[PDB]
Amino acid sequence: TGKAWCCTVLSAFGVVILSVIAHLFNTNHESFVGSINDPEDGPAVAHTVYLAALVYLVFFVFCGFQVYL
Amino acid sequence: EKEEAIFRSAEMALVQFYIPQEISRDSAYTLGQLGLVQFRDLNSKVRAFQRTFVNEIRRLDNVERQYRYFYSLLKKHDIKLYEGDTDKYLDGSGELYVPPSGSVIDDYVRNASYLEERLIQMEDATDQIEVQKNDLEQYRFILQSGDEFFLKVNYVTGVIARDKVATLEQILWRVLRGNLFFKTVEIEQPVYDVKTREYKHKNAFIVFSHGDLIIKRIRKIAESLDANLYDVDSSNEGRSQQLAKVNKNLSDLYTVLKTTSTTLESELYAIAKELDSWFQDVTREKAIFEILNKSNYDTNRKILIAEGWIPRDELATLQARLGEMIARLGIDVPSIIQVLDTNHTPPTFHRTNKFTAGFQSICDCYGIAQYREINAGLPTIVTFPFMFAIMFGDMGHGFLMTLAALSLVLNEKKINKMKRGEIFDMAFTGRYIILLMGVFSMYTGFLYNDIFSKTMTIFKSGWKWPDHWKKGESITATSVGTYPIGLDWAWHGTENALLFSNSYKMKLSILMGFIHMTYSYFFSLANHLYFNSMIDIIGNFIPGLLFMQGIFGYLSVCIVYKWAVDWVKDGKPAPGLLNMLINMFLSPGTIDDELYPHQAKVQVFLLLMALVCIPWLLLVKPLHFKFTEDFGDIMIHQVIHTIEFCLNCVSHTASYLRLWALSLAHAQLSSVLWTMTIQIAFGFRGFVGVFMTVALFAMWFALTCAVLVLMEGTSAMLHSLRLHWVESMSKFFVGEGLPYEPFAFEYKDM
Amino acid sequence: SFSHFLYYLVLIVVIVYGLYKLFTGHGSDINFGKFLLRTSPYMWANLGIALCVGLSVVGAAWGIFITGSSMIGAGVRAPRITTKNLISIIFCEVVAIYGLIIAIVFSSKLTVATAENMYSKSNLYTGYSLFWAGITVGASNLICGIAVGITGATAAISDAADSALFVKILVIEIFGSILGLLGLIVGLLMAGKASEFQ
Amino acid sequence: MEGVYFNIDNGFIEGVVRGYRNGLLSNNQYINLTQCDTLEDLKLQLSSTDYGNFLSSVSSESLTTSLIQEYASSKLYHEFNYIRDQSSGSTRKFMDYITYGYMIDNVALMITGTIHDRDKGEILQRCHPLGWFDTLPTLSVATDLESLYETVLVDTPLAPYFKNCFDTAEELDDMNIEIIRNKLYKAYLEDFYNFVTEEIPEPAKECMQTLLGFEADRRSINIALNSLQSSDIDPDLKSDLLPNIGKLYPLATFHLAQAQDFEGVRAALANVYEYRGFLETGNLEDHFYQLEMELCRDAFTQQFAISTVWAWMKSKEQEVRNITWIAECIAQNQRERINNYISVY
Numbered sequence A: 001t002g003k004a005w006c007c008t009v010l011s012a013f014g015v016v017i018l019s020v021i022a023h024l025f026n027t028n029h030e031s032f033v034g035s036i037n038d039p040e041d042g043p044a045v046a047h048t049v050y051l052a053a054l055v056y057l058v059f060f061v062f063c064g065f066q067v068y069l
Numbered sequence B: 001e002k003e004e005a006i007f008r009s010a011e012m013a014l015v016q017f018y019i020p021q022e023i024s025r026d027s028a029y030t031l032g033q034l035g036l037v038q039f040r041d042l043n044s045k046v047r048a049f050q051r052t053f054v055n056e057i058r059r060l061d062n063v064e065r066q067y068r069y070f071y072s073l074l075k076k077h078d079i080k081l082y083e084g085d086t087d088k089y090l091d092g093s094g095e096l097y098v099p100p101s102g103s104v105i106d107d108y109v110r111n112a113s114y115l116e117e118r119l120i121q122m123e124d125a126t127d128q129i130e131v132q133k134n135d136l137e138q139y140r141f142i143l144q145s146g147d148e149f150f151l152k153v154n155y156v157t158g159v160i161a162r163d164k165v166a167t168l169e170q171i172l173w174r175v176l177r178g179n180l181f182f183k184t185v186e187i188e189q190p191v192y193d194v195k196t197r198e199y200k201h202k203n204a205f206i207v208f209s210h211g212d213l214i215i216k217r218i219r220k221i222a223e224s225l226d227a228n229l230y231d232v233d234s235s236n237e238g239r240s241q242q243l244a245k246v247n248k249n250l251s252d253l254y255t256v257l258k259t260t261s262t263t264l265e266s267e268l269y270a271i272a273k274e275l276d277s278w279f280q281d282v283t284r285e286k287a288i289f290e291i292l293n294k295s296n297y298d299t300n301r302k303i304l305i306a307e308g309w310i311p312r313d314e315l316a317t318l319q320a321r322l323g324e325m326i327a328r329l330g331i332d333v334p335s336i337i338q339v340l341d342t343n344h345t346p347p348t349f350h351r352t353n354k355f356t357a358g359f360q361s362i363c364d365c366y367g368i369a370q371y372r373e374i375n376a377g378l379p380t381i382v383t384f385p386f387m388f389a390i391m392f393g394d395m396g397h398g399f400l401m402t403l404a405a406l407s408l409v410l411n412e413k414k415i416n417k418m419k420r421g422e423i424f425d426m427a428f429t430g431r432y433i434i435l436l437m438g439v440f441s442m443y444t445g446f447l448y449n450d451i452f453s454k455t456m457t458i459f460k461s462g463w464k465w466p467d468h469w470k471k472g473e474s475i476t477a478t479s480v481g482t483y484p485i486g487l488d489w490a491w492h493g494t495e496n497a498l499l500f501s502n503s504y505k506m507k508l509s510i511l512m513g514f515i516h517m518t519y520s521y522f523f524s525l526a527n528h529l530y531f532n533s534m535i536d537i538i539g540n541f542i543p544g545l546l547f548m549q550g551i552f553g554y555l556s557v558c559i560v561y562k563w564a565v566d567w568v569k570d571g572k573p574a575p576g577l578l579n580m581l582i583n584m585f586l587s588p589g590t591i592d593d594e595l596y597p598h599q600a601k602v603q604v605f606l607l608l609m610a611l612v613c614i615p616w617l618l619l620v621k622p623l624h625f626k627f628t629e630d631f632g633d634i635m636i637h638q639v640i641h642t643i644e645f646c647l648n649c650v651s652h653t654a655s656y657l658r659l660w661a662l663s664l665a666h667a668q669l670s671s672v673l674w675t676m677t678i679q680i681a682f683g684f685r686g687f688v689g690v691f692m693t694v695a696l697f698a699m700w701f702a703l704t705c706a707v708l709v710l711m712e713g714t715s716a717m718l719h720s721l722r723l724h725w726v727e728s729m730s731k732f733f734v735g736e737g738l739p740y741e742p743f744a745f746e747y748k749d750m
Numbered sequence C: 001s002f003s004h005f006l007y008y009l010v011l012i013v014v015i016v017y018g019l020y021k022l023f024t025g026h027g028s029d030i031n032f033g034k035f036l037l038r039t040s041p042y043m044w045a046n047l048g049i050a051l052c053v054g055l056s057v058v059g060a061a062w063g064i065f066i067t068g069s070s071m072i073g074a075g076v077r078a079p080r081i082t083t084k085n086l087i088s089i090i091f092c093e094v095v096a097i098y099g100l101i102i103a104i105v106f107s108s109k110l111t112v113a114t115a116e117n118m119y120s121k122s123n124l125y126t127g128y129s130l131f132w133a134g135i136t137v138g139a140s141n142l143i144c145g146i147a148v149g150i151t152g153a154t155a156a157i158s159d160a161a162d163s164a165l166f167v168k169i170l171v172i173e174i175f176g177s178i179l180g181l182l183g184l185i186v187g188l189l190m191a192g193k194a195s196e197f198q
Numbered sequence D: 001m002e003g004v005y006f007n008i009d010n011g012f013i014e015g016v017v018r019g020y021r022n023g024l025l026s027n028n029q030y031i032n033l034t035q036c037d038t039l040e041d042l043k044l045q046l047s048s049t050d051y052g053n054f055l056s057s058v059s060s061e062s063l064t065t066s067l068i069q070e071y072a073s074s075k076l077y078h079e080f081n082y083i084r085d086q087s088s089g090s091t092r093k094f095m096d097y098i099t100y101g102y103m104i105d106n107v108a109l110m111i112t113g114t115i116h117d118r119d120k121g122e123i124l125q126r127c128h129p130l131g132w133f134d135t136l137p138t139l140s141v142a143t144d145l146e147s148l149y150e151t152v153l154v155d156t157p158l159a160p161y162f163k164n165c166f167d168t169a170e171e172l173d174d175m176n177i178e179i180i181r182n183k184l185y186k187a188y189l190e191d192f193y194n195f196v197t198e199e200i201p202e203p204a205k206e207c208m209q210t211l212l213g214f215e216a217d218r219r220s221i222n223i224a225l226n227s228l229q230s231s232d233i234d235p236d237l238k239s240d241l242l243p244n245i246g247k248l249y250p251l252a253t254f255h256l257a258q259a260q261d262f263e264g265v266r267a268a269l270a271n272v273y274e275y276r277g278f279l280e281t282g283n284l285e286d287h288f289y290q291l292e293m294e295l296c297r298d299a300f301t302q303q304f305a306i307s308t309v310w311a312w313m314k315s316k317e318q319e320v321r322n323i324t325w326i327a328e329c330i331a332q333n334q335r336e337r338i339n340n341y342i343s344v345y
């Protein structure tokens, strides 16, 4: 029900947006690390965000079985 | 050779009907099965009771009353109502079927009157028993309470409501002059009244006093208020003794009620499964006589005479179906149908599909179009969602709208069958409006180059930074080329970024409203050339055109020309356009910075031309009326038309700046939302940094889906609507047309 | 009352203070000329731009609930009017647009000036003008907005009575709208010759 | 000025009430009812009006000229309580004062019943529902007034209005009760005159001073003519029954109290043009009703005034009184005075 669809579509695109973000920090894209106030180390931030996306991936597969049944 | 009726309204015809009185009842059923004919009211002066079929309609009006009585008793109980085949009559596709008899309808009368006499009695034989019941329970509950209740005739006792318990107590303080001895005890479960139809909390009170005069006034005050006084004997023997008598009779009373209550409900289950099929077959017998009551009745001959509007394309099918009706009957009847040509305003009718219906339901709110004029519904299919996407303008928020609607489009078969709310209708009624507001917002966002407040980096940039600089040093970029598609990503993060975009989006807004307005003004012409109104062209069109094009076209040509000049290389100074537009009125012949040669010689001419078009708009058409008091009515309508048209060219052009404002606001809130929520998490590390990224992203995504799509989408959507109703449609849309509401049967929800 | 007592206790201190300085040979000490000279012309210019778009929004928001609260009541029995009487909400919004066009024109004139040439003839001229022009456009559109709301609350009630009468009262509602357009003109003439801060 | 601050509280009210007046019947609509034959034809025709389906629950035999007055009035009272609900502040006071004149009538009506020993149910049905308060049926208990006062009527908002009334006899009868009823209106119409002058602003102030002046003048004239039925009454007693706000006060209320006969009344009303010729010709009660409508018709020429709530009720009450007159004439088949209906709209 709606209690499960919510974290399914939410965590669907958390897997997508956070992974596209982490790809860019890793490759040191200018818009994400170009200014001084941006973080100094690109890949260190990506390591922290690859893991955050996996946490949403677990909520996705779990709630997928919940609604599927 | 069937016509399409989307650019202009469909052509219509007026028809006459010579119906005999024998088959009047039968023909009216067939005309309702089509759903094509709209009847006039010929007997428009006759009073409502002097009409002729009024007596037949009361027999059927009384029946509907008797059925409303039945549906009430049902809902008074927990019974659900049977639902039969809503398609057994028709499928809405204009099919034929044979109608009921006159004897079946006369049976619904005596049956429905016969049922009212029984149920009205069975209900009162039930309620009167329940009154006897409630009285005894209160007499029973009070006895359960102990002797302390009777501690402090000696006393008065009864039952009363919680609301009237303080009012009673104050008065008795005043009567007895302070010597008051009052105890009250409550009840938790409410009590359902049978006449008042309410659940009521109640209490039980008791009062003590010895005076004989004083009790009879206590008994009246308690009875003046709704309270029921009871006898209770002071001994603890007389209580249980009376209690046995009461608990005995109550056990008896359960059986007496239990039998009659069931005999009642048994009769309703009969009604509850043959009700919604009787109700339909009565409202349709109503519907035809009202139609037949619009018609003239000859007493010299049984010919009925009637009139109706019909689309000229849908006439050969009318002649067909009636030819079938007469076939089964076996009557010889002359040609029933004769086409009539007379000066009237026909109704307006546009044929819509699933894709055009939602765009057409928007313009019809503002007004129904005149017969055979340009519809405002075709341009609105594109111009309504494109103005939205100038404001909205983002690839992220647009990709979300596109999905939300694309779920409503694919499941439309499932959704249409199931039942819907009131909000979920409009989201479904406009499921194709939202699809195009999303697709275009991905085009406009790509040009603005904004995806969730950030930029793409597809192409090479036309700007170049220095070869070498140092920290904190303000650095400026040098030009290389032009960026092919969209705004260059070098502006992102820049200090002076708004100065560029605000100038850009203003000049976009002014140019895109001038085109939207002029294009809608060439629809006036297209009408005048179809109704052969030559004077209005020379009177209204040609003067008003020159007025605004000479002022607000000169502005738009100058914006495109200034962008196309290399001012720095040539060495000349760029001019301001706000001052150039002001000084040409206030001080013609004067310039401070030149835009092109002979600027002053052309400005003063355009001022001359606009001032000539004012009185030419004012005077030319009334003079033609005089040359051929009414001459005044042609003037005052013509003197108000100009003072509006001239002012409104200044207030409409200014209105289109909301395209710029709602865009700028949407953009800044998106960046502030990114900079406060997700930009923070990246500055953390460890397990604690991982958790914030999980928590903060969810709040970004939720505020995004709600604040920046729903709240901002509904705002911008309604401003796009305004620019159509008030700015575009004012230029050409006359309105005051008659709608098309044919006579057709449908399922009535009851 | 209390609020009116303070208005009369202010007037009595300004008088007793003026006569203390005068009888003592110090009436020159109360010098309005220096205050106008020494105060910064950026103060006067940034009040006017704020009191233009601010006082114009007060008027517009005002007329929208006089015209809006009557339409909704009248629309119970005659629900057909809420789109025909919508034009009154449009002439009340548009005076706010006038206060936003000014602030576009005047914001261009906000530039930084050297410290030696700050209190010059031209930069004082430019602060005085953007102050009284903003007052002019704002206080004048405040009046055009309240007026058009009154006019358009009646036109809602007349239209619910009879459809014909709506057209006849619009003429009153147009003439009221002229007031905001004249104010815009007068402001632009004031600030026409004003030059950006040097 | 008028419209600057009125709409903050009462803009929605003014719009609904001026929509309720457009449903007031016109002269052409009264004629269409006049040429009806039965009550079943009188029902079909009011469906075309703003009354609509106020009789859909009702059968043929059930129709009476009594049951039509009940459901046409009950539709006015739901509309009144709806508007009074949405109100607040001074407008809620104003709409409570309007109801204090309908319960005075019900005080006098329960009490006269007890003197004749009748049941409360038989009496409550004859009571006006806008003049209801919780302890109304409790007045059936006692006959002594001071008993009725202390036990019941102190809590009421009618408590201030009994100052000039503690002269009753130990026993209580009709002519004593009517004297009480008239002392109350005297005090009610003087409190609700000062209330308007203090809190209610213009131009509604000017219009309600007038409308309340007519209610005062109308009573002072009837109270005098009723006294002619009596044997003799001291002059200083009548002075305590006549209010002190209208055009009549002070000069004519003096010469009215000292009026022994019909001619002595005409000597008092001749020096005022507004009321000059009512006695001279025609039915008196109709002349007032025709002047009430004209003043209310002129209250609707205004805008941003809360006086339209008063004007609206009195107009629709007279509408109801015309419906019943036409209805009786139809059933009784007497059609001589069927055109007696009073209409200004």
Ligand SMILES: CCCCCCCC/C=C\CCCCCCCC(=O)OC[C@H](COP(=O)(O)OCCN)OC(=O)CCCCCCC/C=C/CCCCCCCC
Residues within 6 Å of the ligand: B358, B361, B362, B365, B423, B425, B426, B427, B428, B429, B430, B433, B434, B710, B711, B714
């Ligand atoms: C403010 C923040 C919250 C915003 C919440 C938004 C939720 C989504 C709402 C739906 C938006 C998309 C649909 C709007 C476009 C289509 C409208 C349309 O077709 O209207 C037709 C309709 C005429 O036909 P119907 O009355 O529908 O009856 C016949 C139907 N066959 O048109 C009109 O009435 C003319 C006016 C059209 C524009 C009206 C738009 C109104 C939008 C109101 C949004 C309300 C949101 C409420 C949120 C509550 C949440 C619990």
